[PDB]
């Protein structure tokens, strides 16, 4: 329920947040809120101070409170922003002026966010045999648990996920058809938490390892850490960030 904040931009990138702060004058204490792109249920706070951008991850704690690492918990991202408008409490500066969404600009949603509500609805309907207002009351009654369940499993039916197939199989399926640069898929390996990203670069198939660390966080070695595979694909579809190129078209299943 951060959509109600006029300075919440949804799923924009660090770079887009920095472009918006520049457009807003880059004044000390100028700030906006965005959806975290690598922490599930998380937000990011982007603040101008000393003509630079400062970015803070606001995690959703186990108990449904919100905190920057090393900070007190708050009931909501709104409360955290209100609090940091009064007390710096370790932040680079006080939150002075929200940069609001310019007229007509909505919170950005990504591909997962567009499927989320329908996937939660269809799961509750099939699992619990509910319809109409009963169905909506169920969804609302367990929204946080349902959001978590659907986010951790949504990749299974996304077009770029090919399940447990071999290295050799993945090369064959990627090399069939038009050799579109950035054509990609993700496959499961042995360890139930390990994956590979398969990416077409100038007619060659690149294999990048995706490992689950002790937190449950997914990363390519030396790469940004994500709670989910769909976060990883959205990131590497926006910029290469260490890959030889950006992900483009999902490799169709057979």
């Amino acid at each position: 329920s951060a959509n109600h904040l006029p300075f919440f931009f949804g799923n924009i990138t660090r770079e887009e947040a920095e472009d918006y702060l520049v457009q807003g004058g880059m004044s000390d204490g100028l700030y906006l809120l965005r959806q975290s792109r690598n922490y599930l249920g998380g937000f990011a706070l982007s603040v101008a101070h000393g003509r630079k951008a400062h970015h803070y991850t606001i995690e959703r704690e186990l108990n449904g409170t919100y905190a920057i690492a090393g900070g007190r918990t708050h009931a909501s991202p709104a409360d955290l922003c209100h609090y940091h408008s009064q007390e710096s409490d370790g932040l680079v500066c006080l939150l002075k002026k929200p940069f609001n969404r310019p007229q007509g600009v909505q919170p950005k949603t990504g591909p997962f966010e567009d499927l989320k509500e329908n996937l939660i609805r269809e799961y509750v309907k099939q699992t619990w045999n509910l319809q109409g207002q009963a169905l909506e009351q169920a969804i609302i009654s367990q929204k946080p648990q349902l959001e978590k369940l659907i986010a951790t499993t949504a990749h299974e039916k996304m077009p770029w996920f090919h399940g447990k197939i071999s290295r050799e199989e993945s090369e064959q399926i990627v090399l069939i058809g038009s050799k579109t640069n950035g054509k990609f898929l993700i496959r499961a390996r042995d360890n139930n938490g390990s994956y590979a990203l398969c990416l077409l670069h100038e007619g060659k198939v690149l294999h990048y390892r995706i490992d689950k660390d002790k937190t449950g966080k997914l990363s390519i070695p030396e790469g940004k850490k994500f709670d989910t595979l769909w976060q990883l694909v959205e990131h590497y579809s926006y910029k290469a960030d260490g890959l030889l190129r950006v992900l483009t078209v999902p490799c169709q299943k057979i």
């Binding site: 970015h55 991850t57 690492a69 990048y208 390892r209 940004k224």
Partner: peptide, 18 residues
Amino acid sequence: SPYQELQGQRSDVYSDLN
């Protein structure tokens, strides 16, 4: 080198409160 490695280094550093 059966798996490709990331090139460069990450310039995505978040600030925190301590």
